[PDB]
Amino acid sequence: AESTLGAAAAQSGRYFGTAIASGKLGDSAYTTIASREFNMVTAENEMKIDATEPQRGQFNFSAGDRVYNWAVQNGKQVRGHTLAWHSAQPGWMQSLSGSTLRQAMIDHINGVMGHYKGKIAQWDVVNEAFSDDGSGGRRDSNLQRTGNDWIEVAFRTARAADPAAKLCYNDYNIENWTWAKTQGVYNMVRDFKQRGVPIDCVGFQSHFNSGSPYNSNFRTTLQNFAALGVDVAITELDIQGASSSTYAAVTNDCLAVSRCLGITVWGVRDTDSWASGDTPLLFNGDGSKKAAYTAVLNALNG
């Protein structure tokens, strides 16, 4: 196949994934589609820090396992999302600073990766660490305020916690090769690779809209990161208005870069999207395929 997105991606060694939401798992229109079309699953909410460690030291894996087991029973692999992040922190973690927050960050990684050890294809270890103010510099968060080495410490922890997982740095607005943010991250991954920090992948959320338009230099971005010796992934793809041509273009960027592992779109139907008003996904509210679906499919069969 040929007929579905994931089977067609697999023709060139790649995956086509989606974001799954444990709450929509009793909707069978939703699971029929999701099961048929994707070979990769990211839990949309259920593996975030507030979802896995809502009380300090007391982890909660129900919602995460529910998504995990659905995926796995339906033939899919899984991306973990996400271990260290400025948002989606619980109350007890937002209150922490300095070394105590550091210890909590390390503890979270160890615990979450521990529970999922050897069962996760990729982990977004660190998420959205860079700023949008145009400086190319780090976002100012409690995590950053523990010291500039937090990202790297997060990565070394995670490598030791689950040596089988691909470790990703994930971020939005790093798709355009000329943006500061792109270059700030580029420079970090370069520095990492040169010094031997265990980072395996970079995750391009690929949330495209009027404020962050697709640029065909996205292919240059993907090429240049790959050339540092990392894989790349399109992790949270959606496109405001769901242009067929933009959807075919992004798909074709991925197919032209051999270290591009695959594409994940951020939800199944437009009604499931965090931006449902923009109808930015491949399926309509009612389950019918959008033009973009056909364009992506053709490209993957391309």
Structure report:
The structure is a monomer. The chain has 302 residues and is of the alpha/beta class. It has one domain (1-302): TIM Barrel (Alpha-Beta Barrel). Helices cover 37% and strands 17% of the residues. The chain is built from 11 helices and 9 strands. It has an 8-stranded parallel beta barrel, surrounded by 5 helices. It is globular, with a radius of gyration of 18 Å. The two termini are 13 Å apart. The relative contact order is 0.13.
Helix and strand content put the structural class at alpha/beta
- What is the third-level CATH name, the topology? TIM Barrel
Task: State the CATH superfamily name.
Answer: Glycosidases
Number of strands: 9
CATH architecture: Alpha-Beta Barrel
In spatial order, strands of the major sheet run 1-2-3-4-5-6-8-9
Number of helical regions: 11
Give Rg in angstroms. 18 Å
As a percent range, the share of strand residues is 15-25%
The topology string of helices and strands comes to HEHEHHEHHEHEHEEHEHEH
